[PDB]
Amino acid sequence: MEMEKEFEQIDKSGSWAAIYQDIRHEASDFPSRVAKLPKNKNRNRYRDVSPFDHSRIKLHQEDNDYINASLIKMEEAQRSYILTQGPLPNTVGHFWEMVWEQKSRGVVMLNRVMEKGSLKCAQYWPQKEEKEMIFEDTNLKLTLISEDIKSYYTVRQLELENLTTQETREILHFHYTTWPDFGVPESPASFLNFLFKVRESGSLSPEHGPVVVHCSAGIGRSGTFCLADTCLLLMDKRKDPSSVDIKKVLLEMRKFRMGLIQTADQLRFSYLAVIEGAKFIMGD
């Protein structure tokens, strides 16, 4: 069923809450035993958001390999994503260790550091060229190289140095700065423009490790970003684009990380973004 007709059907009948609760009921449940160990309590931002054991990212260290991060591997679309929480004061070095070890090219940030008067993640990158950051627990150095500030997003060039080997890599930071404190955007236009800028940079392509995407919990806005990207790519690839079923794609992604798409409003916004984005993919 053409999603655009499914959309008007749901909207006229006002059944978004009912659709979303069906997804919640059918979603996978897998163990997350490592996340719940006592030694990891200060590595988790939220008590009720944890990576599954089978898909969690492991840090390459013998001490404690735990980070709140998951590998979402989409087999038909041939795309992979790492979804993670906003870093905490005690995990900013782990975060950059993961970026290094997984060979990522890009970091996608979908929140501001402060929202609703409270801190939603640590200030984990440098704000001035001449004031670099050193993470002593993981032996990394991070420098701001350049910054391009636009009306709806900012893109930063960063240099990450492994101080143990003196190798360096360029990392691109894509920061969507205008998601509202409450609710979802009225139009998907600026979010879609942002997704296309990430794509054009190479950060989503198979010659690099998986992109790292986060918000505060790494499931809501972050789930919207990967769900829209994968659905538009599948509409590119298939003989029949109307066969792409966004509810089925979302349930496939929820095999790899719990809770993706946190509200019925985010589900509706994901439909809207895919519908409007297709009017570039299909030839408009």
From Swiss-Prot:
The modification N-acetylmethionine is found at residue 1. Its EC number is 3.1.3.48. Disulfide bonds: none annotated. The keyword ATP-binding does not apply. There is a cross-link at residues 215-216 (N,N-(cysteine-1,S-diyl)serine (Cys-Ser)). The modification Cysteine persulfide is found at residue 215. The modification Phosphoserine is found at residues 50, 242-243. Its main location: endoplasmic reticulum. The modification S-nitrosocysteine is found at residue 215. GO terms for cellular component: cytoplasm; cytoplasmic side of endoplasmic reticulum membrane; cytosol; early endosome; endoplasmic reticulum; endosome lumen; glutamatergic synapse; mitochondrial crista. Residues 3-277 form the Tyrosine-protein phosphatase domain. The keyword Magnesium does not apply. It is found in: Endoplasmic reticulum membrane. Changing residue 50 to A/D: No phosphorylation. It is a peripheral membrane protein. The active site is at residue 215. Oxidized on Cys-215; the Cys-SOH formed in response to redox signaling reacts with the alpha-amido of the following residue to form a sulfenamide cross-link, triggering a conformational change that inhibits substrate binding and activity. The active site can be restored by reduction. Ser-50 is the major site of phosphorylation as compared to Ser-242 and Ser-243. Activated by phosphorylation at Ser-50. GO terms for molecular function: cadherin binding; enzyme binding; ephrin receptor binding; insulin receptor binding; non-membrane spanning protein tyrosine phosphatase activity; protein kinase binding; protein phosphatase 2A binding; protein tyrosine phosphatase activity. Expressed in keratinocytes (at protein level). It catalyses: O-phospho-L-tyrosyl-[protein] + H2O = L-tyrosyl-[protein] + phosphate. Changing residue 181 to A: Substrate-trapping mutant. Interacts with EPHA3 (phosphorylated); dephosphorylates EPHA3 and may regulate its trafficking and function. Interacts with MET. Interacts with NCK1. Tyrosine-protein phosphatase which acts as a regulator of endoplasmic reticulum unfolded protein response. Mediates dephosphorylation of EIF2AK3/PERK; inactivating the protein kinase activity of EIF2AK3/PERK. May play an important role in CKII- and p60c-src-induced signal transduction cascades. May regulate the EFNA5-EPHA3 signaling pathway which modulates cell reorganization and cell-cell repulsion. May also regulate the hepatocyte growth factor receptor signaling pathway through dephosphorylation of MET. This is Tyrosine-protein phosphatase non-receptor type 1. The chain holds residues 1 to 284 of 435 of the full protein.
